[PDB]
A paper describes a structure:
P. aeruginosa however contains another gene, PA0254 that shows less, but significant sequence identity (24%) to E. coli and P. aeruginosa UbiD suggesting that it belongs to the same sequence- and fold family as bona fide UbiD enzymes. The PA0254 polypeptide chain folds into a three-domain structure with overall dimensions of the protein core of 43x48x70 Å.
The structure of PA0254 from P. aeruginosa was determined in two different space groups, P21 and P3221, to 2.3 Å and 1.95 Å resolution, respectively, by a combination of experimental phasing using SeMet-substituted protein and molecular replacement. The refined model of UbiD2 in the trigonal crystal form contains three polypeptide chains (residues -4–494 in chain A, 0–494 in chain B and -7–494 in chain C; residue numbers -7–0 are amino acids from the His6-tag that were disordered to various degrees in the crystal), three Mg2+ ions and 784 water molecules. In all three subunits in the asymmetric unit of the trigonal crystal form of PA0254 the initial electron density maps showed clear difference electron density for a metal center close to an open cleft at the domain interface. The metal ion is bound in octahedral coordination geometry to the Nδ1 atom of the side chain of His188 and one of the carboxyl oxygen atoms of the side chain of Glu229. Four water molecules complete the ligand sphere. The nature of the bound metal ion cannot be determined unambiguously, but based on the ligand geometry, B-factor and electron density it was assigned as a Mg2+ ion. This assignment would also agree with the presence of 0.2 M MgCl2 in the crystallization buffer. The metal binding site is located adjacent to a deep cleft that extends across part of the enzyme surface and may represent the putative active site of the enzyme. In PA0254 crystals of space group P21, there are two such dimers in the asymmetric unit, whereas in space group P3221 crystals two subunits form a biological dimer within the asymmetric unit and the third subunit forms another dimer with a subunit related by the crystallographic two-fold axis.
Residue numbers in the entry:
A (entry chain B): 0 to 494
B (entry chain A): -4 to 494
Write the structure that this text describes.
């Protein structure tokens, strides 16, 4: 059931209900602001994911699932919804998911299983039959530039010769009944492929899978080389291939179990103004930007289709829980592949992927014979120089007496270890990720200025010393007594 | 009737304990446990998991009937009631949070005191040991952390002393390490009120008459930590706090007045000439440093206790424990008074428990900020001077200045602002000349010799906010949806199916 949830969105949703992580909303809600407002609150209260059954003035049978990888208030199970995206059980935490991702990234892909048919074909609208406005397309935040059809799903394109099928995560704003608009980064795989079609004088055939198999959405964001197709890495993630059917109108292959598939082409030169919109950093910047038109020639969907939605903004939402976690997992590979004494990396969801905390193996630190400034520089070059680390402007270096995945502990280290005169290491020569929201006009002209390493390693730690013991349950009591207290917890009378 | 019980909980420790049990915020531990490390270790885990407070009923080698309560102002895992146990120390209900408590404390500091009510008897007098009968070691005196220099009798209560002429009764929070059967040791800082009074008795060639109240009325303990002028008695401020006076009885041996409901009262005197090594001990900053310090002996001449006496304990260290939940909160409230009395555009201050009282977050009213026509560097310096120069602000090395679109009492939102707003080249304002609080754990040897070096203001106000503008809206429930719709969602939450 847990691995089934990973390969099948509809089952994923039933599973949530069974484990008490789903609220069926049967009362009538408005896709104009209300769905988004509710879903946003859900993220912030860490509530069960809502399934809206009754949406004003929308395709009968159509439904919306809010917060598909939001967190849960119950701390023992807080990451369960996220974990299902990777076929992992209810009690899986950041470290379990990171270990699984790192392994997946070393595993072999498994060729997708081609099928003649599948549930996504249960309903088909062609050409003139296409009307996107009939779906419960939400206006997500009050000031958004338009309604968003696609906020949790991926694009599918292919090279003209068919040798490389490319999945990538993307978002699409509704323009009209059969047109959308959304970003295509020229240097991203989708942009590279779009260039190949352009030199033939052709628009790019496209599809978007919404309510895709959770692991297929995961796979779509995996860091893969140019030429390598994402579909196979569903098998790398969960040991079982994704099942695919051919689209109705353009010869692409989309997961068989997907809820809603849009089919069409990315326009050569037509654009619309897209945005403003909430983004991963928690802000909604006010200016719109022209983006390419995606023309929809056909759409297919399951009976009683579920449109999943993300309401991007202040954490934790899917940007942080899925993409942040993946970045964390990649940064740990980067650090360890470099030989750094790092046993964990965590891009705290609370920091909206604007910082990474590196857990430093203090038992191996003295052997480096270094100090804070040199170590900060070394870690800066290594991490910021990587593809994943390019994305994160601030690194916090801290000894592994704390658990870097718990923000309260990071805060404690930050407040009590980082000396204001000696532990603030700015690296203004290092090129920035341009979306970092605190960048100013000079940083933007220069291309650098935003990068920072905050050191929380006390100077003595570079000699293997430590000025004071941590007065916590973990570090203030001998091993035997810790074990006794944990084994007797129930006997004492605690739940 | 929950409100009956809430009110009584503030004035009677024994009832407070019963209140927690009825709310499901107590665990009655009947398993036999060891005062040596085990009780501390369990209580420590309780803070960290935010579990119910444990009342230990069965303690190896202890006075018959003796009990221990751990985590008396620890937090609860239930977010909607997280601060309920703390709140009871201030006469406040289960859903009270940081802001409600700060408001009550600020109003308390300007309310009238109500003189204590003198009684001829109270339950603290139910058992009395005099002189040769005093044996502190019969109580369940914990060794709290593995590397403590001794067992601590007092980690949750206050000292009572009085001026020689009897015109000023002083309560103050303090810890006491066990030295032997009738002797303890702990700090008595000369510049603080207990030390000033001690100096008055010294001038007469006399030791200082003293009592310690343990398991005191929760709002008595709160009153004891209030920032009152010299010459002003803390006891009257139980009345300012909860609208009803504390009830007091005379000690058995030295003329001092102590709360009638206290679980355990020690009576004696503070030695003129004798010291012992006290500590080391876990401290509020989360650390146990290796070296103790000489402190004055407190000789116990008598003690009295309630039947089945409950000794409350604090296992100081990584937050949140009582140093943070009680005293951090009081510091936050005073810093807010400091900021406002100085006319800073600040609507809240919060010493985040998670930062172990090593930083204070200042919530900035951005419209009032624009009126000042200032900038980051000048505003940082102004806040630094004002805040670090105050009695309360002197204690806190780091300040965070941030717009009030976030709730500064929520560490997750503070972390978000900090990561997304503080520019590495422009917003790190160290104040290396401003005098440090010497306990700050990151200070180096040069800082300590010099007396300064560790102060910092972190600016999270974007440049445009100083002109009252903002580069981008906050994409949150609070700020991404209009008032009436948020209200609809809140009001219909249960109708949607949430439980
Ligand atoms: Mg790719
Ligand atoms: Mg005083």
């Amino acid at each position: 059931s847990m691995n089934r949830s990973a390969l099948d969105f509809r089952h994923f949703v039933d599973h949530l209900r069974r484990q008490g992580d789903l609220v069926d909303v049967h009362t009538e809600v408005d896709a104009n602001l209300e769905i988004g407002a509710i879903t946003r609150r859900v993220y912030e209260r860490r509530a069960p994911a809502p399934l809206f059954h009754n949406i004003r003035d929308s395709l009968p049978g159509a439904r919306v699932l809010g917060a598909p990888a939001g967190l849960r208030a119950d701390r023992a199970r807080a990451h369960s919804r996220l974990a299902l995206h990777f076929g992992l059980p209810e009690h899986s935490g950041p470290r379990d998911i990171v270990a699984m991702l790192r392994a997946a990234m070393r595993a072999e892909p498994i060729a997708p299983r081609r099928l003649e048919r599948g549930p996504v074909q249960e309903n088909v609208w062609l050409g003139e039959q296409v009307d996107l406005t009939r779906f419960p397309v939400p206006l997500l935040h009050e000031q958004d530039g338009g309604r968003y059809f696609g906020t949790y799903g991926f694009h599918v394109v292919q090279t003209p010769d068919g040798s490389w099928d490319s999945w990538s995560v993307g978002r699409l704003m509704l323009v009209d009944r059969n047109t959308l608009a959304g970003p295509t980064i020229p240097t991203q795989h989708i942009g590279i492929i779009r260039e190949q079609w352009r030199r033939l004088g052709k628009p790019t055939p496209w599809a978007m899978a919404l309510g895709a198999p959770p692991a297929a959405l995961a796979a779509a964001g995996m860091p893969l080389p140019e030429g390598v197709s994402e579909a196979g890495y569903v098998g790398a993630l969960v040991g079982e291939p994704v099942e695919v059917v051919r689209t109705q109108t353009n010869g692409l292959w989309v997961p068989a179990n997907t809820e809603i598939v849009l089919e069409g082409e990315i326009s050569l030169d037509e654009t619309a103004l897209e945005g403003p919109m909430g983004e991963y950093h928690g802000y909604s910047f006010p200016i719109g930007k022209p983006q390419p038109l995606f023309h929809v020639h056909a759409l297919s969907f399951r009976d009683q289709p579920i449109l999943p939605i993300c309401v991007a903004g202040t954490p934790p939402e899917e940007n942080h829980t899925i993409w942040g976690t993946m970045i964390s997992a990649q940064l740990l590979d980067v650090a360890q592949n470099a030989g750094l004494p790092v046993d964990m990396v965590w891009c705290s969801y609370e920091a909206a992927t604007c910082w990474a905390v590196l857990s430093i193996d203090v038992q191996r630190l003295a052997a480096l014979g270094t100090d804070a400034a040199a170590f900060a520089a070394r870690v800066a070059e290594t991490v910021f120089g990587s593809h994943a680390g390019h994305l994160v402007p601030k690194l916090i270096l801290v000894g592994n007496d704390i658990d870097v995945t718990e923000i309260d502990q990071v805060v404690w280290a930050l407040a009590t270890r980082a000396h204001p005169l000696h532990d603030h290491f700015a690296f203004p020569q290092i090129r920035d990720f341009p979306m970092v929201p605190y960048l100013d006009a000079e940083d933007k002209a220069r291309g650098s200025g935003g990068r920072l390493v905050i050191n929380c390693l006390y100077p003595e730690q570079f000699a293997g010393q430590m000025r004071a013991a941590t007065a916590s349950f973990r570090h203030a009591y001998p091993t035997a007594l810790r074990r006794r207290v944990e084994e007797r917890w129930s006997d004492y009378g605690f739940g």
